[PDB]
Amino acid sequence: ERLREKISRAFYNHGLLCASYPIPIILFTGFCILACCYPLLKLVAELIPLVTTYIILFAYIYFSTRKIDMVKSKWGLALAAVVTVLSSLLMSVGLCTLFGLTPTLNGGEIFPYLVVVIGLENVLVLTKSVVSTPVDLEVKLRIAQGLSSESWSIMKNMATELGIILIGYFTLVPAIQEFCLFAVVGLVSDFFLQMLFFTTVLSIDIRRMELARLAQRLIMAGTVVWIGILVYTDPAGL
Amino acid sequence: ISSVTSQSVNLMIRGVVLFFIGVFLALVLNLLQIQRNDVIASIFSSAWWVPPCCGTASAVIGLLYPSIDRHLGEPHKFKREWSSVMRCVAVFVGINHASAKVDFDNNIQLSLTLAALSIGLWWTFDRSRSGFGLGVGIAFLATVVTQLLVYNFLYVRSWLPCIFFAGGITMGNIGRQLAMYE
Numbered sequence: 001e002r003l004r005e006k007i008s009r010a011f012y013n014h015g016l017l018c019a020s021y022p023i024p025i026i027l028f029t030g031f032c033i034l035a036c037c038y039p040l041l042k043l044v045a046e047l048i049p050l051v052t053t054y055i056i057l058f059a060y061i062y063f064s065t066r067k068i069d070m071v072k073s074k075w076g077l078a079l080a081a082v083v084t085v086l087s088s089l090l091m092s093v094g095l096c097t098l099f100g101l102t103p104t105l106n107g108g109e110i111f112p113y114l115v116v117v118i119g120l121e122n123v124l125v126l127t128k129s130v131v132s133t134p135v136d137l138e139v140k141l142r143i144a145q146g147l148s149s150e151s152w153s154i155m156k157n158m159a160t161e162l163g164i165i166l167i168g169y170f171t172l173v174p175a176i177q178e179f180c181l182f183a184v185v186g187l188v189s190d191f192f193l194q195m196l197f198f199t200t201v202l203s204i205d206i207r208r209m210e211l212a213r214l215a216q217r218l219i220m221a222g223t224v225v226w227i228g229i230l231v232y233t234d235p236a237g238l
Numbered sequence: 239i240s241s242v243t244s245q246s247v248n249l250m251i252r253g254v255v256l257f258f259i260g261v262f263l264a265l266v267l268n269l270l271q272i273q274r275n276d277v278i279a280s281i282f283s284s285a286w287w288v289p290p291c292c293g294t295a296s297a298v299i300g301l302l303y304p305s306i307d308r309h310l311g312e313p314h315k316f317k318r319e320w321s322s323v324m325r326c327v328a329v330f331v332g333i334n335h336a337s338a339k340v341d342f343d344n345n346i347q348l349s350l351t352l353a354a355l356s357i358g359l360w361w362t363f364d365r366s367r368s369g370f371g372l373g374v375g376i377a378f379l380a381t382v383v384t385q386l387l388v389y390n391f392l393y394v395r396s397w398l399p400c401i402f403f404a405g406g407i408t409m410g411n412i413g414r415q416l417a418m419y420e
């Protein structure tokens with residue numbers, strides 16, 4: 001029915017909101033992610049497959065970014081992309097520790113499979129949608145239209161992943177119950193943070209491109225967070 | 239004649255590389271599944287049957303999918319971009335890993351999980367109305383030939399088939415993509 005249009009309309013309005021002012025959104029997300037992580041710090045045979053898995057990972061990244069690159073977009077975008085997923089992942093675990101969870105598994109080994117599951121397409125799709133939007137009469141309304149045009153595919157893909165992982169949880173085995181939970185939460189976090197952060201940084205990059213500086217703060221914050229994540233991973237699975 | 243030789247030997251080298259990748263992969267996964275009982279020497283077990291079978295089956299699968307597509311009809315057009323292929327490989331290892339590092343109360347859970355999983359995979363990385371057919375055919379075949387080479391109730395009868403099928407899909411994908419290369 002007309003639902004999709006309504007979605008787009010309000011979603012498009014949210015775009016007009018997302019870029020009306022970028023900073024508050026950032027500070028908000030940074031504060032929330034940190035306050036979700038807070039608890040995490042205060043509370044040969046077995047090798048080769050793990051390392052090669054990490055290899056597969058790195059190369060997957062390099063590929064989906066080489067393919068991701070588009071005109072008037074800096075390399076650091078992929079860095080932000082990395083940061084996104086990483087931060088989202090963290091928001092999951094530290095939040096799971098809030099309600100009561102038995103951390104039986106090692107995050108160090110799993111993190112790759114998570115990454116692979118939530119993936120990186122759900123941001124390149126929209127970057128392609130928006131950059132295709134002309135480069136004339138708007139810098140903000142540009143992303144507005146670019147976003148309004150992919151809402152339906154976004155939500156459909158999300159609903160499919162939900163169905164998948166719900167089916168997963170419905171397998172009475174515990175390890176996979178736990179994993180499914182981690183993934184669903186990382187998924188919702190990807191949704192929210194992707195919007196709130198990636199939309200705004202794309203807006204400001206397109207502004208600094210057309211008019212011609214948030215990628216610096218995004219990059220630095222994300223590098224600190226990535227160091228913290230490497231640390232949190234290296235000490236639990238060794 | 240040199241130009242025709244260029245095409246033929248491009249096909250050749252493609253199958254060769256696929257062969258070597260399949261060797262590597264079987265090696266690794268076998269190393270994985272045996273972690274329950276000279277590290278280089280410890281890895282090099284089962285020196286006779288597996289490296290040839292897995293490698294050659296992989297290479298033939300790869301060579302085969304594109305050529306039947308071409309000599310039948312339209313090629314593929316989907317997420318089949320390098321990225322999705324790497325994704326497939328990683329998921330393949332993950333699923334082969336679940337086979338060993340976990341214990342279930344029964345067999346039905348195992349088999350059903352694995353079937354539904356390979357199903358989801360397929361729908362995710364190739365929605366061909368055809369791929370299913372050849373995947374299941376080769377699964378059938380490898381399963382029965384293994385069942386015969388043992389004339390000379392456990393995982394022996396459960397994960398072999400689904401993993402054969404998944405490996406087939408993955409290899410065929412890699413082949414069609416390396417063909418779309420050229």
Ligand SMILES: C[C@H](CCCC(C)(C)O)[C@H]1CC[C@H]2[C@@H]3CC=C4C[C@@H](O)CC[C@]4(C)[C@H]3CC[C@]12C
Binds near residue numbers: 176179335336339
């Ligand atoms: C890659 C797939 C899901 C993605 C495939 C699909 C079709 C749903 O997209 C996931 C599903 C189940 C996951 C395993 C669950 C439990 C474990 C145990 C843990 O110790 C090691 C990782 C592992 C084997 C998970 C790997 C990723 C798996 C296969």
